[PDB]
Structures are given as structure tokens and as C-alpha cells.
């Protein structure tokens, strides 16, 4: 099929450096935890606000935000989900 073109895996490798891909996956991993907490564990975003003690707008900006999210904020949210971050070799 001539209408079915480039695979995203090849496109991503062209448009982004290895560092940009590394940062993206990490942002995706955090998003993935918010998603499958809602999908499986049945936790709402405001339910998460009470467990993690971080405000709902700051949680939402992890997903939709232009920029950050801050490190301590990520650690609070992940911890309430039974997860955390660790320094690991590259």
C-alpha cells in the first residue's frame, strides 16, 4: 500500500536525538503510570490529589503541561502509586 508510509520508530529516530528520545520516554513513563492507574486501579485524578498531597492542576500539567514537571512533585505522585525514580547507568 503506497498510502501507508513511514513507521513512527523510523521517523522518531530521524527527527530526534538520542537524548531527546530519552527525555521523551521518561515523560511517557510518568504519563503511563497516571493512565493505567485510572484504567486498572480505578484511581481518579482528585483521588490521587489526596493520596499524593499534590494539587490537581499540578498533576494535570504533568500530562498536558508545556514544561516541567518538577522532580519532587513526580516523586510524590509516583510514590502514592507504589513507584519511584532511581539513578541508573546509561
Amino acid at each position: 500500500n503506497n498510502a501507508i508510509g513511514s513507521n513512527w520508530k523510523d521517523v522518531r529516530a530521524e527527527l530526534f536525538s538520542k537524548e531527546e528520545i530519552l527525555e521523551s520516554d521518561m515523560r511517557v513513563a510518568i504519563m503511563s503510570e497516571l493512565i493505567e492507574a485510572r484504567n486498572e486501579k480505578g484511581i481518579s485524578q482528585k483521588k490521587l490529589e489526596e493520596m499524593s498531597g499534590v494539587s490537581q492542576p499540578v498533576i494535570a500539567r504533568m500530562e498536558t503541561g508545556k514544561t516541567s514537571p518538577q522532580l519532587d512533585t513526580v516523586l510524590k505522585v509516583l510514590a502514592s502509586l507504589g513507584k519511584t525514580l532511581a539513578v541508573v547507568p546509561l
Partner: protein, 119 residues
């Protein structure tokens, strides 16, 4: 894990890729920001499919779905699984996605099925 394919028109150009390559050719911080967000949402679609839910993904009409990084909108469809096909892209000008974009998406989908038959 779901495969993600870019739609190629008759010329052939891949509109979604062409747009991303344009953002890559631009200085200024806004384009870099938009590029990173687009990178995240497509990769997210690859891992979770439509199970990603809102804010990342919303259904529009029939087979047509939209990916929503920031103000950017990428229309896509379910394809022979495990895949998805990214159709084309537009900037949000309105309260909601307009009819015009949806119908262009459906034509592109119809085009895909026809050109897929000729083998």
C-alpha cells in the same frame, strides 16, 4: 505495543511528518516545545492505543480519532492491528474540531482503503 504509520498522499507526501520536519527547521522555543509534546503523545499512542484516554485522545466521528498535544491536532484511525495511521494535522482554531478537518480525514481514510486494494 502498536505500530504507528504515517499517511502518504498521491504526490506522495506525508503531511504529519512534513509538519514535524518543519517544526524541526525552526528556531524559537515554541516549536521545540510543540515538537516534544507531539513526540510524547504519538509514543503514548504506540504503547497504550486508544486506551490512553483523555486528555491525550478524543474520538471525533466514526473511524476518526484525534491526538491532542497542546494546540496541535493529529487525526488518526485504527488500522490492521496492531497499528494506527496518522492522517493529517491542523492547529485548533475553534471551541471544538470543525467539520472540515473531519471530512478531509474521512477522504484520506477512503483513499487508504482504495490504494490498499490495488496491491
Amino acid at each position: 505495543m502498536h505500530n504507528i504509520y504515517f499517511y502518504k498522499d498521491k504526490n506522495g507526501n506525508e503531511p504529519v511528518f512534513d509538519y514535524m520536519r518543519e517544526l524541526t527547521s525552526k528556531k524559537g522555543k515554541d516549536s521545540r516545545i510543540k515538537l516534544n509534546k507531539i513526540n510524547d503523545y504519538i509514543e503514548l499512542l504506540s504503547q497504550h492505543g486508544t486506551r490512553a484516554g483523555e486528555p491525550y485522545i478524543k474520538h471525533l466521528d466514526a473511524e476518526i480519532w484525534e491526538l491532542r498535544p497542546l494546540r496541535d491536532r493529529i487525526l488518526f484511525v485504527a488500522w490492521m492491528d496492531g497499528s494506527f495511521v496518522l492522517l493529517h494535522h491542523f492547529m485548533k482554531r475553534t471551541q471544538k474540531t470543525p467539520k472540515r478537518e473531519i471530512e478531509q480525514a474521512k477522504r484520506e481514510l477512503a483513499d487508504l482503503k482504495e490504494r490498499g486494494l490495488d496491491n
